Amino acid sequence: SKLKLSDWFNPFKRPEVVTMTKWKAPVVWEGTYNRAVLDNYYAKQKITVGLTVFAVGRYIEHYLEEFLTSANKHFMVGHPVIFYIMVDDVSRMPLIELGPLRSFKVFKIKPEKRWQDISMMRMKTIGEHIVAHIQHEVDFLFCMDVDQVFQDKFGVETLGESVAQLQAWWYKADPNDFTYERRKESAAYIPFGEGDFYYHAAIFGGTPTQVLNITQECFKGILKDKKNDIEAQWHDESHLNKYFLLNKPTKILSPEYCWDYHIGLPADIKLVKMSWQTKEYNVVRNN
Numbered sequence: 001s002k003l004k005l006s007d008w009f010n011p012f013k014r015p016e017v018v019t020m021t022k023w024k025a026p027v028v029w030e031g032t033y034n035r036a037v038l039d040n041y042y043a044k045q046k047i048t049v050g051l052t053v054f055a056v057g058r059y060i061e062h063y064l065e066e067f068l069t070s071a072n073k074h075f076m077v078g079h080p081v082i083f084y085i086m087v088d089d090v091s092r093m094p095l096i097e098l099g100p101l102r103s104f105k106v107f108k109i110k111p112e113k114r115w116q117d118i119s120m121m122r123m124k125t126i127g128e129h130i131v132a133h134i135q136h137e138v139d140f141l142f143c144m145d146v147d148q149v150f151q152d153k154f155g156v157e158t159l160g161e162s163v164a165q166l167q168a169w170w171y172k173a174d175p176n177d178f179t180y181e182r183r184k185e186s187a188a189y190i191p192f193g194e195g196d197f198y199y200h201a202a203i204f205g206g207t208p209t210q211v212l213n214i215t216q217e218c219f220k221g222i223l224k225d226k227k228n229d230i231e232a233q234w235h236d237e238s239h240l241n242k243y244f245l246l247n248k249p250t251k252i253l254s255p256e257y258c259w260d261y262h263i264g265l266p267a268d269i270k271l272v273k274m275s276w277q278t279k280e281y282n283v284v285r286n287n
């Protein structure tokens with residue numbers, strides 16, 4: 001209840017970037033938020049935050065440790081956090097020491113053969129875990145790609161009912177340049193006249209209830225396509241964009257929360273909370 005937008009958010013500290021959507025959702029940028037106030041509001045409510053992350057195959061040795069180590073140090077510091085680690089081989093998962101208010105659990109999952117099914121099956125698995133236990137364990141849940149690293153505080157300013165990430169490479173582009181799925185045969189189809197922003201699927205979150213819907217809609221979309229023998233160009237990410245077009249996020253995070261340093265470092269990127277590392281093929285303005 002008790003929390004109003006004017007309590008912690010001030011769009012005027014960032015006039016040159018889009019800080020409010022047409023449906024009145026804040027876009028969080030460095031300088032526009034009062035963490036100090038929200039830390040108190042949330043800690044008084046004894047809020048607990050969940051974080052899912054998958055690492056299968058070579059990704060375990062390449063990124064899991066760095067992701068977890070940076071998460072321990074920077075994710076929702078000062079609040080209970082639970083890391084849910086999904087790997088195909090538990091005997092190869094790094095065991096790092098966690099700090100105050102962090103804890104975790106590991107789950108063994110079946111490794112898919114195609115990398116596009118690995119990234120897309122996460123949608124079903126997250127869904128299953130939410131109804132089985134995450135729903136009862138945390139207040140807010142985030143779902144992240146393992147190949148990225150926290151660089152600075154990623155705090156409670158990021159919490160919300162359904163949270164989206166502004167893909168780094170396309171935040172200034174307009175809808176007709178976004179790489180949405182354009183084949184009407186795909187469930188992720190988004191017409192050339194429509195679209196608000198291009199969201200990055202490396203980070204999305206919200207209440208467990210919301211995340212359940214996101215993941216459930218996305219996964220039935222991914223199945224439908226398989227059934228019709230088509231595969232959305234950017235897989236789960238395309239489905240996430242179709243979902244977020246129909247069900248707008250209540251909060252969106254600026255590119256400072258998921259920055260690709262391959263783009264360089266523009267005036268607009270004030271303080272990076274998280275950056276990409278290396279990857280699969282996420283939508284870059286590449287070949």
Ligand SMILES: O=c1ccn([C@@H]2O[C@H](COP(=O)(O)O)[C@@H](O)[C@H]2O)c(=O)[nH]1
Pocket residue numbers: 053054055056057058059115118119144145146147278279280281282
């Ligand atoms: O071989 C793979 C492919 C994907 N993933 C998971 O799926 C996410 C999708 O990102 P990407 O491979 O599209 O870059 C990864 O960050 C990771 O958590 C793996 O664990 N192993």
Ligand SMILES: [Mn+2]
Pocket residue numbers: 145146147202279280282
């Ligand atoms: Mn990735």
